[PDB]
Nucleic acid binder design. Structure first.
Ligand SMILES: [Mg+2]
Lengths: 121, 98, 117
DNA sequence: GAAGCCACATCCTCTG
DNA sequence: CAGAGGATGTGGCTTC
């Protein structure tokens, strides 16, 4: 199986998911041993390709993301100036400053894919 | 920084460069940061005397110095039998931030 | 080798020991298992997660899935977790879309591998 | 004070 | 053989 049977239950029960349900402190984890100038170019060049490596600093939980099924609603650099806007543990789930390489994000239970994925059983 | 309280190498080594009496085992080499190694096994022998490490020889002492490279404390004078030189421009960034 | 649970019951990995030295050849190389059929070729990277230094430095961090089992030639943990603290290391599986299994209380990374004090 | 650091100790290894 | 360097134990020293 790809997902758990009680897909909605786990997201709204598990301590892990509800801790990341709120808007938490996130930062760019890619190329930690590189100068601030290089890290700013790499991160932005990656976002446009549709991928990056962000972690919730508070909890520690790291992630490698993919903004796809180039894209519009997934990666948006116009919403604000100087910043830009998967199946985790068998649960279908869905900003960073362009100068500081830090900001705020969160998880949100995907009702769309949780029906599509559970139907494949 | 714990170079004050507990004895280092580069800290200990330069006890002997600046001291004219220990020119028997080492000396500065020229205006620029450089040093010779007169008696390579005696150099070690005293480092052993201090470190309470009687087994000590050059090969042992030496390695410790070959760490310094990656850290930007000192560097080698290529080809010269037992001649390295200090990176002071770094020691301060290694003893202070920027 | 010997396996252990994950937060995703679709994937399992090696028993990474309690407490180990900063950047050491691991005592048992890292085995990651795929119970759901994964195309033998998919990449699998890991990211060390902890409240302290949120993303620690790792070496041979990426591996290739082969016969439904991804083996990491020799993973090494450089960035330390701290006193008492251990990594909740993240496990990616590059697919469309990717899937992750988190792993709390994985390993304690200090400059010493636990000696006899 | 064990639990993390630290800066060498000891070691054997290649290769110019 | 000196010289750069991976591995791994060691002991003094700050930090919880
Ligand atoms: Mg070896």
């Amino acid at each position: 199986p790809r997902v758990v049977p009680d897909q909605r239950s786990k997201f709204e029960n598990e301590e892990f998911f509800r801790k990341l349900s709120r808007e938490c402190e996130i930062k760019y984890t890619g190329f930690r041993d590189r100068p601030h100038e290089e890290r700013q170019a790499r991160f932005q060049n990656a976002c446009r390709d549709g991928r990056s490596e962000i972690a919730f600093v508070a909890t520690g939980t790291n992630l490698s993301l993919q903004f796809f099924p180039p894209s519009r609603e997934y990666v948006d650099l116009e919403r604000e100036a100087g910043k830009v806007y998967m199946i985790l543990n068998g649960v279908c789930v869905i900003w960073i400053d362009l100068q500081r390489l830090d900001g705020m994000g969160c998880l949100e239970f995907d009702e769309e894919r949780a029906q599509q994925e559970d139907a494949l059983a | 920084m714990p170079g004050s309280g507990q004895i280092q190498l580069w800290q200990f080594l330069l006890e002997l460069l600046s001291d004219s009496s220990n020119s028997s085992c080492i000396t500065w080499e020229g205006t620029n940061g450089e040093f010779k190694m007169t008696d390579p096994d005696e150099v070690a022998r005293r480092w052993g005397e201090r470190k309470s490490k009687p087994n000590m020889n050059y090969d042992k002492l030496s390695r410790a110095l070959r760490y310094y490279y990656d850290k930007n404390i000192m560097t080698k004078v290529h080809g010269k039998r037992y001649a390295y030189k200090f990176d002071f421009h770094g020691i301060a960034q290694a003893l202070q931030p920027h | 080798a010997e396996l252990v649970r994950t937060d995703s019951p679709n994937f399992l990995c090696s028993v990474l020991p309690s407490h180990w030295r900063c950047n050491k050849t691991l005592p048992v190389a890292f085995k990651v298992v795929a119970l759901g059929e994964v195309p033998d070729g998919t990449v699998v990277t890991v990211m060390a997660g902890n409240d302290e230094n949120y993303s620690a430095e790792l070496r041979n961090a990426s591996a290739v899935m082969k016969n439904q089992v991804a083996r990491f030639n020799d993973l090494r943990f450089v960035g330390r977790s701290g006193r008492g603290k251990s990594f909740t290391l993240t496990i990616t599986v590059f697919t469309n879309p990717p899937q992750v299994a988190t792993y709390h209380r994985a390993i304690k990374v200090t400059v010493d591998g636990p000696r006899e004090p």
